[PDB]
Amino acid sequence: MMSIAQVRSAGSAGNFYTDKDNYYVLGSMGERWAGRGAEQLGLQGSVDKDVFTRLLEGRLPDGADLSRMQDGSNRHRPGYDLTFSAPKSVSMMAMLGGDKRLIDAHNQAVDFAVRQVEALASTRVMTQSETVLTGNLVMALFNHDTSRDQEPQLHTHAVVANVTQHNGEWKTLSSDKVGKTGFIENVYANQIAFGRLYREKLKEQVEALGYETEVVGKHGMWEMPGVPVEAFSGVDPEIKMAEWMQTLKETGFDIRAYRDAADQRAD
Numbered sequence: 359m360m361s362i363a364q365v366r367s368a369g370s371a372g373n374f375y376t377d378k379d380n381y382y383v384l385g386s387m388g389e390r391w392a393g394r395g396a397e398q399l400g401l402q403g404s405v406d407k408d409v410f411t412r413l414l415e416g417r418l419p420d421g422a423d424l425s426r427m428q429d430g431s432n433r434h435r436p437g438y439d440l441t442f443s444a445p446k447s448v449s450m451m452a453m454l455g456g457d458k459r460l461i462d463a464h465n466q467a468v469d470f471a472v473r474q475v476e477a478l479a480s481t482r483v484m485t486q487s488e489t490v491l492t493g494n495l496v497m498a499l500f501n502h503d504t505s506r507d508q509e510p511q512l513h514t515h516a517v518v519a520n521v522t523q524h525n526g527e528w529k530t531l532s533s534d535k536v537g538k539t540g541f542i543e544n545v546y547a548n549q550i551a552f553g554r555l556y557r558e559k560l561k562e563q564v565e566a567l568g569y570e571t572e573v574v575g576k577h578g579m580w581e582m583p584g585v586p587v588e589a590f591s592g593v594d595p596e597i598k599m600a601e602w603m604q605t606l607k608e609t610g611f612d613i614r615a616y617r618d619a620a621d622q623r624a625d
């Protein structure tokens with residue numbers, strides 16, 4: 359699924375997305391830049407925290423600056439956070455099960471969905487304003503491993519900076535409340551579909567690995583049959599991790615055998 363929320367403020371955002379405690383189980387954040395806007399800025403690969411933070415403030419390495427300081431406060435909205443969450447069975451198998459290929463499958467599915475989101479990129483150019491498609495965004499993807507309930511959950515925070523290049527200049531992303539022609543409005547209207555696109559893309563890959571899937575909800579929500587999702591549904595990263603492993607062992611589920619059955623059943 360894909361959750362949508364506005365990024366709070368430049369600083370705390372920087373700290374949240376790169377906070378080690380959010381990806382302790384994964385061991386890595388696996389962050390990377392994405393979006394045609396990023397390639398145009400020369401931003402590729404790993405994300406430097408200072409550059410990411412300044413970007414959320416509206417300051418580009420390009421030299422362009424969209425910050426609007428009003429008595430110590432920046433009124434430039436940082437951007438949006440689109441979170442793609444993998445199904446519980448995948449998260450368990452990836453993080454507690456050892457199958458790292460599923461993390462990679464999760465990334466590729468997220469990468470795929472984010473491209474379709476980028477196509478909605480637009481800016482407001484009042485000639486009466488109007489929205490004009492831009493087709494480029496600057497994004498930073500960060501992987502986290504825990505849900506709000508402290509259960510295993512592989513999810514990627516797709517942070518979309520509030521900037522976009524139009525006719526050479528960097529402008530803020532479109533916002534149209536009334537006609538709902540703005541970028542964010544178009545994202546909301548397709549929230550389900552995008553989360554759907556990500557899930558479908560992830561499903562194809564997991565099935566190519568030899569894994570089975572089963573629809574457990576609406577809009578195609580699915581889980582890998584047989585995985586004890588139940589056990590994980592209902593302060594110190596190291597202790598939390600030890601607990602997850604402990605409650606899993608107590609489910610009696612033989613993870614490795616599950617993996618081998620997928621292998622001897624793939625190709």
Ligand SMILES: [Mg+2]
Nearest residue numbers: 380502504515
């Ligand atoms: Mg998180």
